[PDB]
Structure formats: structure tokens, C-alpha cells
């Protein structure tokens, strides 16, 4: 695929109602796809992966995102991922910390592609859950709940090619 900024769609589908039984049950999935067409297709991927249904024998009853509950509350997510690694499938439990669940998942994809160089076509998310400070576990996240935090901007540098290429002074890299 080609991730932009993931938006957390929700899809509900079923097999077509055969004459044998008036209607089969209805299935709900929470799927991260940059647009709802890809949401539909990946829903079919998951469904055919789990139970013997295909879009040929199914219709997508509902397809739309879930707007974020309280997108102004900083929340730290634990994310249960399962990927493939050029030598065999690996389960894995990563962790992130952001505002919107979609933001957390997009961070997960970006940092899996970087820190573990597995493309976005081999990652299938199981769970993403906002969890409390007593269940967060990796230290990198853990160091960001302090009632008071202070840290300077250590070595700060910014752009000066639009500001002139040829200036007569030199930049200050303190404040």
C-alpha cells in the first residue's frame, strides 16, 4: 500500500443472503486505511483470511471512519502487531504515544518501516488500545508522565538558505 496519514475506518459485512438461511450474521472490523476504498479491499483480505468469504460472495454493509473520541487528550497506546521478516513471521508488541489512534498507528507503520525495514504490505494489526501508565511498558514511552518535565532545546539549528545564501555574519546555535 502507500500510507499517507491513516484514518481508522470501520467496516461491517456479510455473505449474501442465500435461500438456505434468510440471513447470515454481520461482522465488524476496525481497519486502518488512507481511504475507504482501500478500507473495503483490506476488509475483504481479512475476511477471506479468517472465514471462507470473498467479496464475490459478500457485500459490504457499512463503511465509514470512527471520528476520534477526544482528540485533545494525550494518550499512550499499546499496539499488538504481527509482521513478516524475510525469515519467518514474528509477533511483536510495540508502543507509541500520540493523540489520535490513527496517529498512533501511522507512527507504528513509519517506525516499523524504519527501525525494522518491513514494508507496509506485510503488517497486519491486531489490537491498538489506549492503556494507563501502569500498563505501558517500554521505557522510551515510560519516561513521559511527569507532573513536571523540563529539558532545554540542546543544540538548535534552523534554515538559512532562504535567508541569504551570502550573509556577512554567522549563525548563533545557542538560542
Amino acid at each position: 500500500k502507500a500510507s499517507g496519514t491513516l484514518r481508522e475506518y470501520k467496516v461491517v459485512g456479510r455473505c449474501l443472503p442465500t435461500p438456505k438461511c434468510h440471513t447470515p450474521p454481520l461482522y465488524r472490523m476496525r481497519i486502518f486505511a488512507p481511504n475507504h476504498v482501500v478500507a473495503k479491499s483490506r476488509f475483504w483480505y481479512f475476511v477471506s483470511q479468517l472465514k471462507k468469504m470473498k467479496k464475490s460472495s459478500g457485500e459490504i454493509v457499512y463503511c465509514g471512519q470512527v471520528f476520534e473520541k477526544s482528540p485533545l487528550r494525550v494518550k499512550n497506546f499499546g499496539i499488538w502487531l504481527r509482521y513478516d521478516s524475510r525469515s519467518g513471521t514474528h509477533n511483536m508488541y510495540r508502543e507509541y504515544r500520540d493523540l489520535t489512534t490513527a496517529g498512533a498507528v501511522t507512527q507504528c507503520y513509519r517506525d516499523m518501516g524504519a527501525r525494522h525495514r518491513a514494508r507496509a504490505h506485510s503488517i497486519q494489526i491486531m489490537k491498538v488500545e489506549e492503556i494507563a501508565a501502569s500498563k505501558c511498558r517500554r521505557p522510551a514511552v515510560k519516561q513521559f508522565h511527569d507532573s513536571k518535565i523540563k529539558f532545554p532545546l540542546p543544540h538548535r539549528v534552523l534554515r538559512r538558505q532562504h535567508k541569504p545564501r551570502f550573509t556577512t555574519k554567522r549563525p548563533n546555535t545557542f538560542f
Binding site: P139, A140, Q143, F151, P154
Partner: protein, 190 residues
């Protein structure tokens, strides 16, 4: 990772004095003054306290191989304190089997002459580091006493003299004759 902060603090004895212009730390006490300018260590050296109780090294946003440096700088300035307040002394005993090592100090403070090594007629003039006083002692039969303030300096000179007297194309498991650093020490003791 990039740990947000790491710190270390040294409680300075009052009988010493420390000045700083940026990373350059200068320590002046009873036995003299020392300088050391820590460029490319990239830390925050701060001095706090009435009678300058404590010094604080702080490393911001460091990685693992970079938090490693904080306690290194701690130990460096600690040994600087040890030198300025006490002074470092090293002691050398020269093992010999059939050729008694003849070491004399050709000039007073440095320039150690070494001869009669294994039968070698080759004299050596090992040049002690500047700011280091060599002194053959006398209460121990074969004893070199190296003294200074910068443990870097005294120990460097020490290993230099030890390594300059070694065999070539011989078994070092039986042939052993030579000088060696033996018992690392200071000048005066608590």
C-alpha cells in the same frame, strides 16, 4: 532511545577552588593548579553551593554511547581533585635475574638513564613527562618513585618506562627482566 537527562554530582572539598569558562575546568588547591579543557564532550558543567559544595555534570538528550561519557568526565575531574589535593605517586620495582638493572636519574627531575639490561650495552635515556619528578628511593632496594599531579601524566610516563625495557625475540614467559609499575599511589594520605 535518547534518554532525556542524565546527571552526576561531585561534592568538592572546601580546601580546593574551581574556576570555569565553558568546558575549561581549572582546579587550584594546596599542591598547585591544573587545567583541563573538555571539548567534544558536549556536557553541562555547573557549580552550585555556598563554599561551592557541589559540581553537576548534565547530559541532555543523550544516546547510550553518549551517556557513557558522563561518569567518565566525573572520574576525570575526580582524579584531578585527587592530584591537586594529594598528588599522585607511582612505585616501580625492576626484576632481574643475572644482570642487576642499573637505573640512575641522569638529570634531577627527569631523563632516567637505564643500563645493564640482560647484558645489553645499550644505554637508554627515558624522558619523563613534563611536570613529573622521578626519584630513586632507598628504603626499598630497587625502587623508582614517580611523582606528579596529573595521573594521566605520571601513569603515562610510568607505562612508558616499563615498556621501553623489554626483550626482543625472547620468551617472555621465562625471560622476565625489566621494570614494572607495581603499586599505584598518592603523595600524602588521610
Amino acid at each position: 532511545m535518547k534518554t532525556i537527562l542524565s546527571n552526576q554530582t561531585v561534592d568538592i572539598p572546601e580546601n580546593v577552588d574551581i574556576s570555569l569558562k565553558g568546558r575549561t575546568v581549572i582546579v587550584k588547591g594546596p599542591r598547585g593548579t591544573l587545567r583541563r579543557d573538555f571539548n567534544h564532550i558536549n556536557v553541562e558543567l555547573s557549580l552550585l553551593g555556598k563554599k561551592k559544595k557541589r559540581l553537576r555534570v548534565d547530559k541532555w538528550w543523550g544516546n547510550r554511547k553518549e551517556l557513557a561519557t558522563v561518569r567518565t568526565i566525573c572520574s576525570h575531574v575526580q582524579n584531578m581533585i585527587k592530584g591537586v589535593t594529594l598528588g599522585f605517586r607511582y612505585k616501580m620495582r625492576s626484576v632481574y635475574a643475572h644482570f642487576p638493572i642499573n637505573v640512575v636519574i641522569q638529570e634531577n627531575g627527569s631523563l632516567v638513564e637505564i643500563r645493564n639490561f640482560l647484558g645489553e650495552k645499550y644505554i637508554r635515556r627515558v624522558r619523563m613527562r613534563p611536570g613529573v619528578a622521578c626519584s630513586v628511593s632507598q628504603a626499598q632496594k630497587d625502587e623508582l618513585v614517580l611523582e606528579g599531579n596529573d595521573i594521566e601524566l605520571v601513569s603515562n610516563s610510568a607505562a612508558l618506562i616499563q615498556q621501553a625495557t623489554t626483550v626482543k625475540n625472547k620468551d617472555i614467559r621465562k625471560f622476565l627482566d625489566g621494570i614494572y609499575v607495581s603499586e599505584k599511589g598518592t603523595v600524602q594520605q588521610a
